[PDB]
Amino acid sequence: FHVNKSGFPIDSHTWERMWMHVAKVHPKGGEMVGAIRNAAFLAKPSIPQVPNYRLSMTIPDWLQAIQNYMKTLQYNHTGTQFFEIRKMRPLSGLMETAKEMTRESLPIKCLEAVILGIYLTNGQPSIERFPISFKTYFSGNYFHHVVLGIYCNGRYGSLGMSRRAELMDKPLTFRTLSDLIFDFEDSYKKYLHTVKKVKIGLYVPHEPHSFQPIEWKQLVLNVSKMLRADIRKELEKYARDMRMKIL
Amino acid sequence: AQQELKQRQRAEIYALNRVMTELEQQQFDEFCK
Ligand SMILES: *CC(=O)[C@H](Cc1ccccc1)NS(=O)(=O)c1ccc(C)cc1
Ligand SMILES: *CC(=O)[C@H](Cc1ccccc1)NS(=O)(=O)c1ccc(C)cc1
Numbered sequence: 001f002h003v004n005k006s007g008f009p010i011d012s013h014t015w016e017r018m019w020m021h022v023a024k025v026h027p028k029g030g031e032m033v034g035a036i037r038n039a040a041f042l043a044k045p046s047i048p049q050v051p052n053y054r055l056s057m058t059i060p061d062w063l064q065a066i067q068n069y070m071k072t073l074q075y076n077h078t079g080t081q082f083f084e085i086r087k088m089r090p091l092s093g094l095m096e097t098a099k100e101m102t103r104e105s106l107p108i109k110c111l112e113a114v115i116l117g118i119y120l121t122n123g124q125p126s127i128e129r130f131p132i133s134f135k136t137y138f139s140g141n142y143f144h145h146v147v148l149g150i151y152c153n154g155r156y157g158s159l160g161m162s163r164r165a166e167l168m169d170k171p172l173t174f175r176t177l178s179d180l181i182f183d184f185e186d187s188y189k190k191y192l193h194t195v196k197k198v199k200i201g202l203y204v205p206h207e208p209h210s211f212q213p214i215e216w217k218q219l220v221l222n223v224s225k226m227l228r229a230d231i232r233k234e235l236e237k238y239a240r241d242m243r244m245k246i247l
Numbered sequence: 248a249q250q251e252l253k254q255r256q257r258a259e260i261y262a263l264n265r266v267m268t269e270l271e272q273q274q275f276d277e278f279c280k
Contacts, residue, residue: 009252022263025270032266042258077267078260106257107264163271 003081008104010082018080025079048072050102053124059152060172063127063159066120067169070161076107077163085111090211091204095119110146113161113168117148121159122208127152130242131216132181133199136188137224142196149180149200151242156180166190177239178232185223196224200235203242218247 002021004014019037023029036042051065076082083097083106098119101108108116114131121127128151136143147160147168156177160168166187174180177200185195202215219238223231241247 009249009256015256018263022267026266036259036262036266042255042262044254044258045261074261074264074268077264077271079267082260104253104257106260 001081002079003084005084008100014080018078021079047105051120059124059126062124063150063157063169063172066117067159069120070108070113070116070159073101073105074107075161075163076109078107081109081112082106083108083112085115087111087216088213090213091118091207092209092211094214095122095208108161110161113159114146114148117159118204118214119208121148121150122206125206128242129204131199131201131204131214132158132184133197133201133216134184134188134195135197135199136193137196138191138193143193147184149177151177151239156239164191176232176236178235181231181235182228194224196222198223198235200238202247 002014002017004010006014019033023033026032048069051062051069053062057065082104083101085094085097094115095118097112098116101112101116102119118129121129130149130151132147132149134145136145145162145167147158147162150157150159150172152172154175155172156170156174156179157172158168158170158180162168164187167184170180170183174183181198188195198219198221199217200219202218204214205212219234221231221234226234238247
């Protein structure tokens with residue numbers, strides 16, 4: 001996994017190293033790398049319009065519009081992440097990078113989806129936004145995933161980008177934080193991942209000029225050795241703390 | 248003439264992304280099978 005620190009347009013070292021990785025993993029790479037690289041003309045892909053909240057939308061409607069915008073950007077399968085996200089950057093500068101995303105319109109992976117999730121949900125203060133991170137185990141490997149948890153009018157949900165349809169957006173229909181988290185765990189069971197750790201962040205402030213970093217891990221719990229009855233408790237205490245604006 | 252580089256690279260990136268998506272489904276399908 002390579003990340004582009006060159007900005008736009010992309011400089012030659014990082015560009016070539018993308019086609020590098022693309023020609024190795026593809027069983028018929030190189031044959032097809034040339035066909036894109038060397039082609040006098042390519043179709044100019046459609047630029048999706050960035051959604052704006054209109055008074056005829058419910059919150060679920062706006063949330064689906066944000067998620068549909070991200071799906072149109074597409075998940076990044078190229079191997080080269082195009083927008084660098086430094087997790088502990090001030091919120092202010094991550095928002096600058098989200099602006100980059102909407103204005104450059106390129107594929108994105110899960111972390112960048114979360115930043116853009118935040119950027120598109122600033123401006124609706126009925127929605128609270130907080131990152132959910134998962135460490136999971138499959139076949140002798142550990143993997144890391146992240147989504148945007150969502151809380152609004154007593155219901156929980158998520159926005160996200162994933163290669164798997166069941167590990168991104170979740171409608172605003174879960175009555176506890178635990179029901180949300182437990183849906184992800186069951187979704188991971190479909191792909192034979194065991195959830196080892198779950199990290200819940202803090203509400204992301206709606207000040208887009210905040211220079212504080214996002215809090216990614218106020219709660220960390222080792223769901224592997226824990227029973228569901230006790231995962232629920234630990235998660236339910238923490239969600240309620242979030243709502244009572246203690247944490 | 249710097250924008251033109253973006254627009255072309257965008258067009259190549261989406262072109263390439265189509266292929267890796269279609270690849271990843273055949274890989275995942277033949278996995279299952
Ligand atoms: C957040 C991210 O980059 C992941 C990468 C990943 C995570 C878990 C397992 C493999 C790869 N996003 S993801 O590629 O969409 C993804 C893929 C597969 C699963 C089972 C979950 C997430
Ligand atoms: C083969 C496989 O792991 C999938 C997993 C899955 C994921 C989400 C929801 C249901 C199932 N099983 S499958 O999709 O039913 C499937 C796909 C392709 C083949 C050849 C067999 C089974």
